[PDB]
Amino acid sequence: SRARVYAEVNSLRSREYWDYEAHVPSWGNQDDYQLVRKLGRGKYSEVFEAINITNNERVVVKILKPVKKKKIKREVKILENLRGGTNIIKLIDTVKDPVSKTPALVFEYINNTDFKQLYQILTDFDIRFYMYELLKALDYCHSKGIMHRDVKPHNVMIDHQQKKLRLIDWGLAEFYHPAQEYNVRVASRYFKGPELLVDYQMYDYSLDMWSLGCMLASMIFRREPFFHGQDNYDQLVRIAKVLGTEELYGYLKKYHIDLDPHFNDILGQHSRKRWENFIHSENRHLVSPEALDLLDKLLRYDHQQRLTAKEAMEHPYFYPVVKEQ
Numbered sequence: 001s002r003a004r005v006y007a008e009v010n011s012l013r014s015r016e017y018w019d020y021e022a023h024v025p026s027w028g029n030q031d032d033y034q035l036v037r038k039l040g041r042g043k044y045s046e047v048f049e050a051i052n053i054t055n056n057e058r059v060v061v062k063i064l065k066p067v068k069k070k071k072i073k074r075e076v077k078i079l080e081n082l083r084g085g086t087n088i089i090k091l092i093d094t095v096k097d098p099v100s101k102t103p104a105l106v107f108e109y110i111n112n113t114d115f116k117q118l119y120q121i122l123t124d125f126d127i128r129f130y131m132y133e134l135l136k137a138l139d140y141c142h143s144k145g146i147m148h149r150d151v152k153p154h155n156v157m158i159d160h161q162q163k164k165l166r167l168i169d170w171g172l173a174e175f176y177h178p179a180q181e182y183n184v185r186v187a188s189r190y191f192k193g194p195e196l197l198v199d200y201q202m203y204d205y206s207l208d209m210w211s212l213g214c215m216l217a218s219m220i221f222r223r224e225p226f227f228h229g230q231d232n233y234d235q236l237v238r239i240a241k242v243l244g245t246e247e248l249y250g251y252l253k254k255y256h257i258d259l260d261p262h263f264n265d266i267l268g269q270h271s272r273k274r275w276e277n278f279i280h281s282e283n284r285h286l287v288s289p290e291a292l293d294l295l296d297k298l299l300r301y302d303h304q305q306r307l308t309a310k311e312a313m314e315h316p317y318f319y320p321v322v323k324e325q
């Protein structure tokens, strides 16, 4: 019902800061930028590589689908607010196609190595280092009043050789205001907090912290995704087989959450599992008591009890990354 950190931070800022409908982007010319290669199409997006001919700075170009002005302003405004923030993808320009008049956003390029080939090779230290760096990103945007709402491996770009991390794709990010009711059609199925799966709209930054748990578990147990749901119903079932079904009803009770009657026939009764149930010889080298303590405190039904980004950065799991700063 209310975020445990930074709950009020947007109300203590100028309305200009969080009133995105009133933001006016200056739309440049999308012809100075020359497409090279469609690094993958998407929902309201298709993404390409290219060169700022005005000097030759490599870049990435995300071509919005302008049947929603408001979503466009929301994202532009949020990136304006996070410019130069710890580990956030730098937005360079906002542009449009002259003859076509369709808008687009231009992003610093990143030689990322694909998580599907990089998670195979991470050491126990790598995992702690990059997670810390993802945490810094999340504590920044949260303290700037903002929920990412789509934390997941594809949106955590990692240049292993430069040891750089950039969290990206802010087309779902949103200003947090207390008591505000949000859409649950955010985040990838596998990284959706249970609040979204039970349709509880009064959520907050703590959702990203669940998403981050999911990433952490997949990394130290090498099961990616960790909670591999078939749909939104099955996803909550997968979670409950691990966290226990009694500890789910307790949450719903606490927050007065109406449970769709279709869950009765499929939830069953499950006990809370031991996070050691997931260790085996292929991932033992990545799992430590301090790693499972962090994990237990990230993946909770009660979004309010979830470790914040700053609490998590303080965890002993990260003491190896602190000293090596």
Ligand SMILES: N#C/C(=C\c1c[nH]c2ccccc12)c1n[nH]c(N)c1C#N
Pocket (backbone or CB within 6 Å): 039, 040, 041, 047, 060, 062, 089, 107, 108, 109, 110, 154, 155, 168, 169
């Ligand atoms: N995920 C993401 C983003 C781009 C991509 C989307 N599909 C891809 C497939 C292969 C290589 C890159 C991307 C993104 N947003 N901003 C950037 N510089 C990005 C990059 N790369």
